[PDB]
Symmetry: D3
């Protein structure tokens, strides 16, 4: 440890002295941080912080998303072995990404959870790192948006991939519900519906609150490039937060989720869209609702890890293009 010209074969997440660079791993072993990034709470010189919020108390059907962050970390091992495709660079050579670990909260006092998540995000945002957050159920995005609006102003543009709009009316602000937190976000003025977009939608709301909806059928009909171009058109250059609910994907591709809805996107379609979002002013992102107890050979977590990897690459390109 620390010896001159020490080669780092294995366990880079706990051994690498710098936030930059990859190191050799056996894919089936080694410390399982997200894409093997350094485990640390030190935020100096960091561009992106990956962290987990292991919540499933706000779920309406199956529970299990509390284990989502660990599942996505475990599923990210192969993505660490090679330069991401089609990017063809190692993003960690010039993008400083760490794994913070998780947002602790006291589940047994559930009204403390929302402020715990706001404070977690507030703390990270004081560093000027971007947040890439692994869920956990979709409720987490509401306090994340609160903290993001503090830093980046309001209203924000939301880019929301989901089978569900999560904007069903809820007359109780204090409720812990993964299906009504974007109703609250709109009512709080956190997000601008006319400059926001929901992609892969295939469930019904009497009032989508004026948010642009590109439903699953629309995506299938028009294709990924058309979808990507419509997203760019809607958000323009506004500060945008991207929230990816893995149940956007068809249950064939994402069986490991609490509220599966037939007729969704393939991972190919979703990734083609995410990979093309380089023109967007992406301020923060999350990937939510992975429930490993319902996963099958980790395929859901693997797809979630790919989304997260492509989000990192988008940030690498933004940093490298401004250099």
């Amino acid at each position: 440890p620390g010896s001159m010209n020490e080669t780092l074969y294995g366990d880079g997440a706990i051994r690498r002295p710098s936030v930059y660079g990859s190191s050799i791993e056996n894919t089936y072993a080694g410390v399982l941080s997200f894409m093997r990034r350094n485990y640390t709470r030190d935020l100096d010189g960091v561009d992106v912080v990956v962290s987990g919020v292991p919540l499933d108390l706000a779920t309406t059907f199956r529970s299990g998303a509390r284990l989502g962050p660990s599942a996505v970390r475990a599923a990210s091992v192969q993505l660490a072995e090679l330069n991401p495709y089609p990017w063809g660079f190692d993003p960690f050579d010039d993008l400083a990404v760490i794994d913070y670990g998780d947002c602790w909260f006291d589940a047994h006092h559930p009204l403390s959870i929302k402020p715990a998540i706001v404070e977690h995000a507030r703390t990270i945002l004081q560093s000027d790192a971007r947040m890439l957050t692994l869920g956990g159920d979709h409720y987490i995005t509401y306090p994340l948006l609160i903290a993001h609006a503090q830093k980046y102003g309001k209203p924000l543009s939301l880019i929301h991939f989901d089978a569900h709009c999560d904007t069903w009316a809820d007359d109780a602000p204090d409720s812990l519900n993964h299906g009504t937190m974007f109703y609250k976000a709109v009512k709080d003025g956190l997000i601008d519906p006319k400059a926001s977009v929901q992609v892969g939608i295939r469930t019904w709301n009497d009032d989508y609150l004026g948010i642009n909806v590109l439903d699953a059928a629309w995506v299938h009909e028009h294709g990924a490039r058309a979808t990507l171009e419509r997203i760019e058109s809607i958000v323009g250059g506004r500060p945008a937060y991207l929230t990816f609910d893995i149940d956007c994907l068809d249950p064939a591709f994402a069986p490991g989720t609490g509220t599966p809805v037939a007729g969704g996107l393939s991972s190919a379609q979703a990734l083609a869209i995410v990979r093309g979002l380089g023109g967007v002013n992406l301020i923060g992102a999350d990937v939510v609702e992975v429930a490993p107890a319902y996963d099958q050979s980790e395929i859901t977590a693997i797809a979630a890890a790919h989304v997260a990897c492509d989000l990192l690459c988008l940030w690498r390109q933004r940093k490298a293009g401004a250099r």
Copy 2:
């Protein structure tokens, strides 16, 4: 509005109740459990058969798997419909066709009698399988009420028209050969969709194979189905193995290269002008299902069929 267990508490056959999605009585889409058919528009029932299967068994548990997989569909108005179908359409869950499996020759007449009983009420039947053999006695009873020959709209990897001249045989792969021979269905005005297995003699039934559907798309498939059946009385039978094993792992005879659930639902949703007299959704085998995704796709098909009947009940189509 009632909170919890609407299937056993609502005094009316109409309307939805508030449920926790992970609890409450598990009838199909939470509809009232009852054997009283008076004023009912659609009867959901199960026929828990797998004795006719040629590969894996397990379809005998299909009806309970489809009921359990229907809980999310009861929470919201179906998409893209945007109505609660149960405000205007009276749908009940009858429970199941009982039969003595240990006397398997008694099974065909038990299914015919189950259907004859329900059809006496003028309700439509939406039947959950069970293996595909069940559709043959169901068609016998439907031909009694609606006349013959019927148009068959058949989603499946398999034609189920392989030759079989033994009448009393119990085979999920030959009952539509028997159906054509009995004059129950008109091959020229029938259509098989998603086919990807070989028969030397498809009996003149129109076939839109899986490769055809992939090449031409859902709208083209839908329009070809409409062209073939026209205004004729039609029975729709959906074998979940129509879908690729990726979308429907939970089935007895999986065949690679099938439809997505997005394709299949796009087709079914567009069939509202068809004179659908009855329907079934078969071959769900929960022992081979993975996180219920097969049963979920089956429940979506069943839900869309109810929405087609709601539009017709309401005078829209």
Copy 3:
């Protein structure tokens, strides 16, 4: 006038069994009548689908449905070794579930207390299916109202659930600490069986740890339980994680070195002289179950509890 299929929704009487295909039919607990009418009822089975108090894996919210599905074989034959059909003499119904607004978690405790209050007003016994173990605390509140306090608790669990907690908290590991402080249970006349986790302060409750049960045997364990509770009113709470993970993999907090189902059932079946006022069977998490074996073991415990009540109603004990 024996009915064939779907007895739970068809029998006019609360007494008696019907013929079912084991793989079909309405899935109430042991096929008992689904009803909210408590008149003349001896035991009410209900679910409380909670998992918000869990400390490791979630999933117990689906426990009640899993235990119901797992009870189908128990309905087919007279329970063994009893050799009677308990439902000829004991009126048992399935009430469905306690509804609650999960998104307002502070409302859950009073919802469960009210559910139990309502049922206990009928003088039926409650046999409650969990759900995480927190449900037992509000169940005890309601039971102590009816039957007096302090009650004797017979608690099967790998966990004492008596770890100190100073605060309205929702925790399946601290509710028996609250129960003791509230004066709901008498520690000296209470017993915890299968314990294999550490507490600095077991609150004077008698502990028969898993190793003690293995060393002394089921008969010794039963007799020690009986000695501890004597003739006092007792509530029996069975956390399925009492059983070793080999027998009960489907649970949120599995701990190695537990009881077999043979051991647990030998104990429960022998508790016929105890004044059991109520009971529950908790912590079944079907997402972690394997070929339903956990839910099957839970259903067997519940069945035996019913048989104990039948024997008491019948004057045999």
Copy 4:
């Protein structure tokens, strides 16, 4: 000695071959695949039936599951026997009894004829199920050969003696009522082990219930079995649901409170005194199995039965 695929390569019915455990032709314990019965001591075959089941289906795939689960048993001499039984005992894998499931009344006579054919060779049959109904037509053929009544040694959570006066029903829970009423088995000289379900009329068959076995132990159970059957021609039928669901989750009718595989194997291994004329191992349902543990326990039972016959042949 041959390397790989001994089941399709060995010219002799005797002897073992070197296999990679994770490859090679999957006959039962790698035995020769053949229909030639000349000079054979034991014929292993499958009857892939699950049409007679009352709860979960799946036992139709039992024989293939058991064969796949037997790979490790072929690698070493069985324990505690410590001999390779195939050096002295000629055992083949016949494959399966074919039947037309779509004509279900043809199944019973197909199984009788399957057994009658093999029994003409004087080999013993070790049959892999398949649901328990298969034991009834197997007993019909065995009674033809060995005389009636036979002694039945029956390991099961279920007595399978519930009344059923329709002879041609296909029911895995009533076929031993038919066997008793037909005079195929002598109830007074038969025994049921691991029982933990209720019948109002056990037909006078001796029952050693699961609780009894737990209380008294394998040695006591074994000795009671011997006392009941004495030297009478005995058929052993092992329903894997005798084992607790923890040990045998892969079965159609799981009942809590069962035997461990340690208990069952200790009993079976001790049966060298029994005049064992034929046996089966039934109700493995691989769709419900978990990491093959049920099929593994079933393959162990079958292996031990082969070892019992090796010992009897030597004595």
Copy 5:
């Protein structure tokens, strides 16, 4: 016409037998189990290797999983072909290549010798893996027979051409770098289909990545393949991880955004103009499979390869 267990009963290498789909000897598509190669057109064999894997192990059980998954394909004429290929094409199941895993340096020559032996008969090889490393020693033997350099048609999420200058290494991700360096395959006349991982140096092999296939479709892809290989002797190697993890979860290195089985089969079925000299289907890992869907997709690919050979024999 025989009823049941045709793999061990048919005296001729041609023709099909009646099987219960859920029973019967489990050779690949029920073909005769034999090591006799006289008059044989195609030999199916397994190479149960996973020592060369970089992530999950489990491919060692691939050959048995693909054989089990092939039962339905044997019941009907393959679609859309509409003929029984086994009436005109003599296909056998050889069993597996045995190797001493405990001496891993012996594995490569064992596989070369397995292939050399089979190829002396002029039968084509259709080989079931096993991890992708197997294709390297297979290409060595194929180059001995058919000359060097061969055209490679490679379906995979991975190029397997990452640099590796240690000769004796056992690595499923570097063996095609070795194949190119050894002059076994011609990069300019080879093609990799479904690629979605990065290499700084694809060695000039033509790449049609997963995104390209999704954009342009099966017909455009198959036509580009034909254009690249022309009439050169071509070896087809199909890594099941070419398919998206939704269709092929049972594999050691799953990568999102892959092909459907509909796309892959449409391409493979269209390759009748290619001078196909041998083929393999690799990386099925049944411990990670879900209701056999991966092994089923793999069996479908193998079936279609057999139908291509039947057509080429007829031409």
Copy 6:
């Protein structure tokens, strides 16, 4: 006290932190992830090998599965011990032994060097497998430090003493005996239920023997056999019946319960325990983590034995 991710945040190697059981960094029993061995009593490390397996592969993922399965054990004082071992015993998670799998002849010396390096610190090794072959190079390193011959306490359905450069998880204890690493007369195998023509004079308490005579009789026989000799304990999870340990490469019916196995291990406080491993967990075959959970319990109890021995010294 820290709330969450103690494995990467605690400045001291002693003490526990508050964790949500379903979250936080997944080191073994949440111990500090570090390669600094100064002042360390026990080093937990993984050796993710399955190249030596004879049936199912999958043990390469064993160490990660055992780590993940150890989360509940970190929440409470271990039972029946009733102390937090980490207040007095310094335990770290080193991570894993790296090796180049694609050059398999390099693996044995890599494992030896791994152990040699850790043993230079005087910490004890508790190693998570990985297939059983790992114990052979571990024993080589341990015999270098502690002298030849060692006592072996071996829990397994398999004797691994079948007669035999080879990489084989079933022959490495034949080599160990022939190399003079272990003394068979002062060694013991527990749970055995597979056949060898020559058990090499090692004392065997087979599965049936344990079932017949019980855990107390077994543990007393063990203590008797090994006396005060330096002893290495190797626990193959397939010692347990497949009902308790389905997640393993070579499952054999008729095995021990976790209750039996833990009763035996917990009672081994008189043994001069110099090193230990827990091997053959294959998570691809595990069912609701039960195999990995039993393996984590065995490892926890080994830590508790060392805590007691440090206190008794």
